[PDB]
Design a protein around this nucleic acid. Structure first.
Lengths: 99, 69, 200
RNA sequence: ACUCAACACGGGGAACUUUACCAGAUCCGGACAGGGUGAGGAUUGACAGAUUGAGUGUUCUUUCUCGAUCCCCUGAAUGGUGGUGCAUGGCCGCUUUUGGUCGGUGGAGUGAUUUGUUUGGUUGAUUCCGUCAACGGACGAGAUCCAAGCUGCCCAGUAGGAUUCAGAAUUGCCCCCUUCCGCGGGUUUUACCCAAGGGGGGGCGGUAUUCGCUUGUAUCCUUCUCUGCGGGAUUCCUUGUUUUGCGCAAGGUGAGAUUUUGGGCAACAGCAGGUCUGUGAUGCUCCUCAAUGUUCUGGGCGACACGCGCACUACAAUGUCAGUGAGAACAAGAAAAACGACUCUUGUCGGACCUACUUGAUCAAAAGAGUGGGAAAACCCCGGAAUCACGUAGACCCACUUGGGACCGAGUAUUGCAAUUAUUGGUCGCGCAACGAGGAAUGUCUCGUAGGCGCAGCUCAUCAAACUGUGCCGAUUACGUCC
């Protein structure tokens, strides 16, 4: 492995606060940053009939979720990673998968 | 096609309150409009600014009618 | 993953539900769920706090416990909070609760309806509506509606200015619908769907 | 459920379960104890034999083993896919995809009323403009939202290119342009022109024979990929047409030319439309210990049982790929991860899901087995789809034929606790069973559309001619009217 921080979320304008600002700490602030960035957004798509009984003209609804995914890289910091990560914990339903 | 009365109304107000345009360019006019107005549609801004131009072209001739003295 | 999301989702559902139902007449409105790593912070947003929190904290600690046994948290990995959301008029859910309570206690139709619509439009709401269906007069049901101010009903901009709620009132001789709408003076941040405006 | 708004509809492709229905047996899931039960109490469970569909203590015989709530009797409680959708909530469908709906102030009338919301033009649109006793608002329309086409900034160790160096391999092409002069023919002397030949001028093997997604060294880059937030036109011209107006037609500009394209949303007033088989959504009633409850209990039935009518689907009658054989190229949305057992230490690893390679294969398919990767832009995957293409000297030849298969017998393997009324694959025989372009009548469609073709998701041990979604090949006619 290397140090790979991934960020996943259910909406945009959530990810951007975490990534695109508040990984500031590793950016130009103290140490090197190699920044790759963002990945295929996936769609989770659940088609569902609209009538609670059997009648009608056979209408439907389609519902959707969006996933959002991000990814950034650091070249062996030796427990500066503690600092860098911990400052943004922010926004409900953003999760942070550090490797 | 035909322009709704949202468009028309808005556009009139501008021609009045500003002669920091008089241009027959869609382009020049547009970049005034979008920093003078808040509508939060980019679509509306196009149609407004377009109509504006088609007022100023008329204004260079006889009476426009129904847009002050 | 695809899965982590759905976990958070189904969680948030069940959570919401259990509070909405079993905690009544406090003007329950919303929650929020979030995590900081290795904690869970769930706030609760209801008009009247002194009922929520209990006399000395019995009620809040109660809820805590309930949750922990279901979703299999340890203590100190779950903590709950309360908040007053003041300006009661500008929540659908709040006024839906209140209205329900009165109809269950054998108040009329039009009297009760009006009383809501007052308190709403005094809070500064743009317009509101209220509906009641179900029994009234006797036989063949009936539906009636009461309207004040103005509101939009199309687009996706009635899904960001107008949040609604629907509840039941269980009575003898019929169930009875109730519903309350309420258009806000504000968005969820700011946005106006139309209304072009000239700033001199 | 029964015209349009019943009839591949009730996510309804049901082996058991699911399941309402039928035959038979079982269990309390009868709370709450007011009324009865000494240390044994009232009580629970059972080997064996018998009863029985049942090596089912259901029940009996027999004896052992155990909370005293369990147990006995009335009241009451409860559960129910029982009844009523003409008791009712919620949700959905339809009226209705049409452009419609309402009030304030002012005006006119003694007022029931009207103007606004009207004769006209215009637009998909109560969309605008003109006239004008109306003016200014709110809903619907429009706009805001989602996806598609083009583009800016961003980005790479999961996207993919460039150059250099080494190593490996084939080891060969089944030059050209321009110009001048001469002469013999064709020439009417001549000018002109064709054949042949010679000379001069200019290209040129350029800092390059060609080829490796396992064939490796070095260096560099972001055109092609990904994505968040942003750019991107009724403008311009024809001075045509129109009233100067609202606009309209043709052309231009451009990635895109007129609701740019396809969706989602959608007022007021309603229907005695559907649903009590979605729900700890329910009023009143029905049923309750030999039950209409529970019953994941054993067996049967279910949308399945067979002269016959109807709806929707799929496959054909072949020689416009047409049919069995061969070889070549080639697609994108999407799908997979956790279930108290296991081994790990002191509070947690691996496996239950996909798929590759290899073997099996010193001899059919289907099957079998071992190993490895992937939690998904890393594995599968360079996703080798089918339609399709062929200078493949391929077979076939107009026939119900090698066109089509329906029915029908035998053998075998997998799925599952259970495949018998064949469940699903997979090879032999049955084809001599229909059917040769289809009457009256009738369905929905205007451009990446119609039609043809294939894949995935859905349901889910197993099985899709269905439904939802994505891609490939890709037209004819009209662009009008009110019959």
């Amino acid at each position: 492995q290397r140090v790979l921080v991934k960020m996943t979320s259910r909406n945009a304008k959530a990810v951007e606060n975490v990534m695109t600002e508040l990984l500031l700490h590793a950016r130009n602030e103290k140490v090197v940053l190699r920044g790759p960035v963002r990945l295929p957004t996936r769609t989770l798509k659940v088609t569902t009939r609209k009538t609670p009984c059997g009648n009608g003209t056979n209408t439907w609804d389609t519902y959707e979720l969006k996933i959002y995914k991000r990814l950034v890289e650091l070249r062996a910091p030796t427990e500066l990673v503690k600092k860098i990560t911990s400052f943004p914990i922010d926004a409900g339903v953003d999760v942070a998968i550090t490797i | 096609k035909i322009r709704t009365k949202t468009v028309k109304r808005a556009s009139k107000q501008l021609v009045e309150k500003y002669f920091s345009k008089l241009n027959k360019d869609f382009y020049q006019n547009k970049r005034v409009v979008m920093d003078v107005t808040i509508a939060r549609s980019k679509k509306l801004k196009n149609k407004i600014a377009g109509y504006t131009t088609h007022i100023m072209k008329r204004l260079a001739r006889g009476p426009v009618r129904g847009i002050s003295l | 993953k695809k899965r982590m999301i759905i976990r958070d989702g189904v969680f948030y559902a069940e959570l919401f539900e259990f509070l909405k139902r079993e905690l009544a007449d406090d003007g329950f409105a919303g929650v929020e769920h979030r995590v900081t790593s290795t904690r869970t912070e769930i706030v609760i947003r209801a008009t009247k706090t002194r009922e929520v929190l209990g006399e000395k904290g019995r009620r809040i600690r109660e809820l805590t416990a309930c949750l922990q046994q279901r979703f299999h948290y340890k203590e100190g990995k779950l903590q709950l909070f309360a908040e007053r959301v003041e300006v009661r008029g500008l929540s659908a859910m709040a006024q839906a609760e209140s209205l329900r309570f009165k109809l269950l206690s054998n108040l009329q139709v039009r009297r009760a309806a009006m009383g809501i619509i007052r308190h709403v439009m005094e809070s500064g709401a743009k317009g509101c509506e209220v509906t009641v269906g179900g029994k009234i007069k006797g036989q063949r049901a009936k539906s009636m509606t009461f309207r004040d101010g103005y509101m939009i009903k199309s687009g996706t901009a009635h899904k960001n200015f107008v949040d609604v709620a629907t509840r039941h009132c269980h009575l003898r001789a019929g169930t009875l619908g109730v519903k309350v709408k309420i258009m806000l003076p504000k968005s969820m941040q700011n946005e106006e769907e139309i209304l072009p405006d000239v700033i001199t």
